[model samples]
Target: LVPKLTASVTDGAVGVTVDAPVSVTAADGVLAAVTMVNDNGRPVAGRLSPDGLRWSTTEQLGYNRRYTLNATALGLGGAATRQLTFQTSSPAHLTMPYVMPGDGEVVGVGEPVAIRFDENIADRGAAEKAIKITTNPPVEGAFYWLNNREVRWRPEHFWKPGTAVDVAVNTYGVDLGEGMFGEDNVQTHFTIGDEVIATADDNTKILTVRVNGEVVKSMPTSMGKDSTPTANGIYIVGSRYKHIIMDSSTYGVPVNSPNGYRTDVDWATQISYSGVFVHSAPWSVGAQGHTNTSHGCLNVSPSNAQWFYDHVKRGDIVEVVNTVGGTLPGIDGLGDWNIPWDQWRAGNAK
Candidate 1:
C-alpha cells in the first residue's frame, strides 16, 4: 500500500498565523524529501527527521506571504507526492508592545510592570492572556487594564527589595480582533532596589526618608501656598532630572497669570504627571517648614534635595499625606498602588 502524507498547514489555508510551523509527515513510509518555497521562488529552511518520517520548517514565516510546501515520500508500494499552500495573515493593524521599567533597570518597591500598545485592542481578553509576568520569589499579582492600550501588573504587596521580575509579551501573530494583530514578541527584566520610601506630610511640612523601615533622612519642605494645594496620594518615583525648568504654563497656568512662575530647579524627582515634583527650591528657603509658600511642588533645600535624588531611584515610593487636593488619579505617574486591590482585580480582562 502507498503511504499517505499529511501537513500541519491545510492546503489553501488563508490568514494563517506566522507562529505556526509548516510540518509534514508520512504514514506507512518515510519521507524522501520535503521543501517549502515562498512566492518569491525562494526556499524556506526546514529539517527532516533522521527516520525520514517527519519534516518541519526551521525558519519563521513572513506576514502576508504565500508559501507552497511540496512533500515527497517513499512508500512500500511506490513513491507519492503532495503539495500544500498557505498564506500568512496581513493584519490591518500591527500593534507593538512597549514595556517598563525597561530591561536591566533598577526600580523601587512600588513599581508595577506595564505593557502599552500603540494601537487600541478590540479584544482585551486576548491581549491580556498574551502578556506574562514572572518574579524571582514567585509573588502573586493581578493584571489590570489602564485603558484601551495599556495594561499593568502589580503584586499583591510591594515588591521585596532585591526581587527580580521578568515580563514576556508573546503576542506575535496573535489575533487581537478587528483584523489587528500583534507585531512581535518582547521581554524585559528589572530588579527592585532597597526599600526606599519618602513620606511627605503637608501639615508638618516635613519629608522623612526611610530604608527598610528605618528612618534615614529628614528634611523640611514647603508645600503648596494655598490656591494650588498638593493632592494626597501614594506617588511612585518617576523621571529624575538633575536640572530642569519648571514652567507653570506646562500645566495650564500662564507664566504671566497669578501663582505662575517659570523656575529652574535641580535634583528634581517626578512623583506625578500633573507637574508635582519634590525638587530643590532655594528661593523658598525662608518659607520651608514654616509656611506653604510655593506652588504645588514640595520645595526643599539644595543639599537635602540632592541627597534624596541620589538615594532614591525610579519606582521608589514617595507618598504624600495631609494634602487638601485629595487623592491623585490612578493613571498618573506609576500610581497603580493607589488603586484598591479589590477594585484593581476587577479590571482583569483575562
Candidate 2:
C-alpha cells in the first residue's frame, strides 16, 4: 500500500521542502473508507522550497513511530485519478530505560542523576518502572519523574563513600503514548571515592583535604596572620583541580617578597573551593599548627599534601566540625553537610 501508492507522486517531488500542513482537508477513495484520525483533519496551504523535489511537514512528528499518509488533488474539472502515500522521515529509533542530560554530563559526587526520555511518556507507572537504580549493598533510593520525558533518582541520603552505583533503563515494551514504544535499555555505573576533610576557623583560616579518614596525619596549617586572621567555620572538600598556584593578592593582599604573597607557588595538589587547598608550603613549614600564621591556608609537608591530594574525589564527605568562632552555614546546597543524619533523611520527601 505504501511503495505502490507512493510511486504515483512525481519523482521530482521527492526531496526536502517545507509547508507540509498537518491537518487533513479530506480523504478520497479508499482513504474515505479508512477511519484514520488526522489529529486535525485539514489541508495545509503553503509553498515547498528547494523545489517540489522535496517537502517537509510544518508539524513535528513523533519518535519511534510509523506514519502512513495518502493525498489526492480534486479540482473544478474533476478529482485526480491517482493517489500518493508515504511514511514520514524516520529517526534513529531509540527507546526504553535511557535518558540524556541537557549539557553533556558531569560525573561527580555533587552532581545528581538526570535522565531525558526521547518523547513525552504517557504511562507514568510503567514509565517509572522501566528504569532501575541500585547501589552496592542496596542503598534505599527513589525515582521521581518531573514530567513525561524526564526523571531523576537519588539515594535517601548522600551516597556512602566508596559505594558503587548502577542504573538500568528497561525501555523494551514500554508505551510512550500515540502508538509509540521504546526500543532499547541503557545502563551506567559509577563509584564514590574516599572521604574528604574541609575544616575552617573564625580567624579566616581553613584547611580542606581528602584522606583515608582512618589515617590521621596532623599537618601544621597557618591562618590569617596578625590583623587578617582566617575566619572560623565548617567546610567541605568540594573539588580538586591539580597543579594550581596560590596568591594572596588575588584575595586583596599586597605581595611582600619576604612573605612571598605575590609569587606564584607551584603545588602538586589542590582540593576544595577553587583556590583554598592543602598543598606544600616550603616557606611556611616553620609556622604550621602552632601559630595562626599563614595568610589562611593549610600549610603541610610535601608528603602529607600529596597523600591528601591523591585520595579524594568529588562526592566524598568533609566537615569543619569543631570551629569555635564561626558558625556552620546552612547545608542546603552542600548536601548533607551540617544536617544531622536523621534530618538529612527527612529531606527526601519522597
> The CA-based lDDT of model 2 is what?
0.46
What is the per-residue lDDT of model 2 for residues 1-350, given as tens digits with 9 covering 90 to 100?
12111222232233211112333332231122111122254443322333222233454333323333444434333443333333332333434445432222233343345466777666656666666766776777555554566665656565566666766666554454454456655667676554445443323334444354453544556644655333344334444545565675554455674444644444434333323455666777766665655554556666656765666544444444333324333332233244444554443223
lDDT of 1 at 46: 95
Across 230-309, the per-residue lDDT of candidate 1 in tens digits comes to 77888889989999999988877899998788988999998887788889999988899888877888899999999988
- Cα-based TM-score, every candidate: 0.92, 0.44
Best by TM-score: 1
Give the residue spans of candidate 1 off by over 4 A: 1-4, 26-28, 49-54, 75-79, 252-254, 348-350
- In model 1, what is the error at residue 347, expressed in angstroms? 1.1
